[PDB]
Symmetry: D2
Subunit: 341 residues, 4 copies
């Protein structure tokens, strides 16, 4: 009963998030098992550093999980846009583990980056959706994310499934640490609840439809403010708004230096986020605030819109925070007469 494949795929996320984890997480014993990697983990872990390489929304899923990889593994992790990585002729060597994220497994720049790394003797790992695609075959090992086919022209469920697979990879790499056992358990217990929480967040759609019916839909640009874990969410929202809604958007690191969406969930509620919000409300700017259920980020003596989402484990919050942006980008396009498919 969906208008477009994009809307269908947004609403499939409870199922795709569940399918990504299926048969890979023992939620009772708190054990992650990635069959595709299991013989390789000890080698993956013995590298000088990890380089995540991807394009577009897949590059965003790398940004969204970089912190949790560095936290859990204590291996340096850098995140590269495949085209820029190639542009700079970035040296890579036998001691590098290069992790390629791609829904299609066919993106030309990701393929060229893969071949470049392979030629230089690096160990390569694919986080891929299309089973047996080029990137899937040509990487040494990997995880098929099992999101199902993506027929929309923009990444929705691929993003949240990539992000989950990447978190499972980080957990897998760090499964031998006693000191990080509590953190592992917390994240694993949080993952179990994500699919039902995504269902809850999808219930924002009517509020989001009301917002996109407003003069929000005739704006020439929309800025998204975020920091920490939620900066990747800001960049991904802005990509979706440009690509889907044909509206200019920019994801801005909040407070570092027209409608505004600010991420103010607890995981990323920094003093600089508060002061950036306060700057907008000082000029009576009417921001749209994504925050956790029950938190009053702005008092009622300032006009603002709130989009409340469940609180999850800090490094998983982006899984839920992205959903309203996917929905906004979709409804803005529909109100603007755009066929998003």
């Amino acid at each position: 009963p969906y208008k477009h494949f994009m809307q269908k795929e947004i609403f499939e996320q409870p199922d795709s998030a569940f399918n990504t984890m299926r048969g890979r997480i023992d939620f009772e014993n708190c054990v992650v098992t990635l069959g595709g990697l299991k013989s390789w983990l000890s080698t993956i872990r013995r590298c000088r550093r990890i380089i995540m390489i991807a394009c577009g929304t897949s590059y965003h899923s790398c940004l969204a999980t970089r912190s949790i990889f560095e936290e859990l593994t204590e291996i340096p992790v850098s995140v590269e846009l495949a085209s820029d990585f190639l542009d700079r002729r970035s040296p890579v060597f036998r001691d590098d583990t290069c992790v390629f994220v791609s829904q299609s497994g066919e993106t030309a720049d990701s393929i060229l980056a893969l071949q470049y790394c392979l030629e230089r003797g690096a160990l390569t790992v694919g986080i891929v959706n299309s089973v047996g695609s080029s990137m899937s075959r040509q990487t040494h090992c990997g995880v098929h994310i099992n999101a199902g086919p993506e027929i929309g022209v923009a990444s929705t469920k691929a993003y949240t499934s990539q992000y989950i697979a990447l978190v499972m990879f980080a957990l897998s790499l760090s499964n031998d640490s006693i000191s990080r056992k509590g953190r592992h358990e917390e994240i694993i217990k949080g993952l179990q609840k994500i699919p039902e929480q995504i269902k809850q967040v999808l219930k924002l759609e009517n509020k989001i439809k009301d917002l996109c019916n407003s003069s929000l839909n005739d704006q020439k640009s929309l800025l998204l403010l975020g920091r920490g874990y939620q900066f990747a969410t800001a960049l991904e929202g802005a990509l979706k708004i440009k690509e889907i809604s044909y509206m200019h958007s920019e994801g801005v690191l909040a407070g570092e230096l027209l409608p505004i969406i600010a991420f103010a969930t607890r995981d990323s509620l920094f003093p600089k986020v508060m002061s950036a919000i306060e700057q907008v409300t000082a000029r009576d700017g009417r921001p749209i605030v994504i925050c956790n259920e029950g938190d009053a980020i702005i008092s009622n003596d300032k006009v603002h819109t709130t989009l409340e989402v469940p609180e999850t484990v800090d490094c998983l919050q982006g899984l839920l925070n992205v959903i309203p942006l996917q929905l906004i980008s979709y409804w803005l396009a529909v109100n603007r007469g755009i066929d998003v498919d």
Copy 2:
């Protein structure tokens, strides 16, 4: 003779570039000596990775030099914005060399990041303009860039930082036979930089005309860049934002086919870096995409180059230098653009 300190500081760059290099480069024998790091180089060469950490324009000078560091040293180099590095609580260890770049040597987020790295046992290196400032005192070793005071947003500090960082990369790679020719190339290039900066500064009249005829009334402008000139595009955007109080965004040229450029107005000001060092197919496609929609791009390119036709555009020509140095010349017209946009708006840039 100058209306503002900012204008003085821009015009000072041939002299500040020369003073940054003074006593440090033997241009005849192609040898770089940085006294403050001399004895620490073998230790820096040895680390797991180099993390460059800075705020604002100093963060851009790190982006502008990341590639040549990687190329000359084959040591991994990442570039972190000080506040974001602290927000992610990025792990740092004894085997990291952390390089802190700061004009003032006093920026709170840079000092906080320094303290975090010191506490974790990392080796710390300062690239600082204010001698004996907190950052200078608290780093293990470093290079005072010797650019002189800034009373103006960073202009001569950016070029001097970028030069100091290039000198640092050359020092780290001074024992390599295979890199000897690339070293010589860059050092001979550096020798010519101060006079080429003098040359680029001659664009100011063309720039004042362009601001008076196409830019003053504008609300936003976009900068397109890729490779070595992506940092330049980010820095130009920051200058335009901070100095001129106009919206600006640096855009990775041609990365998105259906991104901002598929969205732009016909009259929106767009500056493209199209110097030979960063003249990628994706840069040409981006320019095309503007040119077909009847935008008239402002093309920064090398002297004599014909980047586009028939097709209406403004050209700002700059001398060709070594690829990894071209950003030193390319930033200068953006400094001048941002300055003139601001004064034509009654804004006090000092």
Copy 3:
């Protein structure tokens, strides 16, 4: 009651082994806490490699524990004799952790080696018995082995306490590993029983006095055969016989190549090549002295010295004791004043 200090210090080892562990191992919870290293462990784990540097018997305690360091930490471990390390001018860097083992903390080549590594920016760790000695002060961090003063001329209790301290250091480095938890616990429970097992091994003394009253004390050379964990023990037994008994001795890697002989044949190091070497000796009616675990029959004429079975990597602590007593009684029989 003891005839010599060396004899007293051998017999003191149940107590010095306990004292070395005292306040540092929780045996019910299987937790090792070394207060000297507490805040430095995370840095030591980070390094490119560990270099253990020492002289004489202290060099042997590094060979004796190299394998367990490697096994538990997965960090490359090399073992260097201080003088030879200096002789090769072996390069050292910021990313090396250099571990210095010294009873006295004053040995000239060990000091010169420490100063060399310090100048080169390495992280330095001392395993030292004399509190506040040069090596204790000048290392960045370390563990005082708490063996008490050594008055005897040769290292006895210092060897076994060094070896225990080094094992505790390996356990501390690997205390964050889930996969090594089982092995950790095994080694910790083993360590708990070491002092009482040393008491038991000391009861071999009469058997060893009988052996040293024989024509064994009139021999020109004594060969010690070992492999694996027990190769260090063979080297240390050879050193003791030369230095105390004034009898030539060599520790030989058993059966590597194609006269009294002592063979280490405890279960931890009972390789095919050891059994082959032993069979070569018996085939020529050589009459070996076999050190082996209580109840084991290694050969069906020979002398057997039985020692309790402990965890493989701790067996060296018990196997060295009969060599200490053999070297001591051979000396007494040969009229040498060991003190």
Copy 4:
């Protein structure tokens, strides 16, 4: 003309040393080129550490060149005996470069160690004489040392050819260093002279024959004292004496123990000391004085013209040309090969 293949192989070393270097060293321009390692050098360097693994005399060739590998490359280098490496189950990983030195390419413990390292993801490099042997096939890359077939039961020319190949490997690894160029040129010019210097050393055979017919023949044991570069040579001399001459021998780190074996030796115990300038340490001189003070009459291997022991006190000298310090072992080993050979002939052993 030779009595035995072993004698032939010893006297063949000028030719085998030349053949190992042939087509690999430009002595004019000081360039080392090892085709087998060509495009692997940048990868070999990019490692946490180098592990040299071998058995018997091949393990000695690794000990003899460890110091120069460490000096030229600044990569950690450890040397392991293949059987002991296996006994310890020493952990090996993807970031290790494991270098296997083997004349035959078929020694069981070296092959087992290789399989262990291969399955753990390490990069493996063979320094092998028998072309297409198991070790040569199974390593990722390597250098065939080109010594020619070795028919004698004990390694002679394979030792000096292995040692030379390992030095060439060390030079290849460090060929991009400006600060190393002078040391590289010094060693390469040294190497060019080694074949003719080996011929000079072989002129010692008459003196050695005489010595092996002496009161030396009747003794049951021989100690060798060495330090630094020449410790490997002392160990290799001891192996040759044990394995060929069937006499007890031990190589001793000279002057390490003030009251070790040297305080126990009989007046007439045969002792060879290496006292060439590259390894002429104060402790070596101390060890030598300890022997002569007890009326021992040592055999001194020293450089042409050097007076290590006063002519007042009764000692034998075997003089060898001086070469670059890290190459002196190539010359110092020759008299031990000849001594082991003639001791054996004088005792009736068939060395073949």
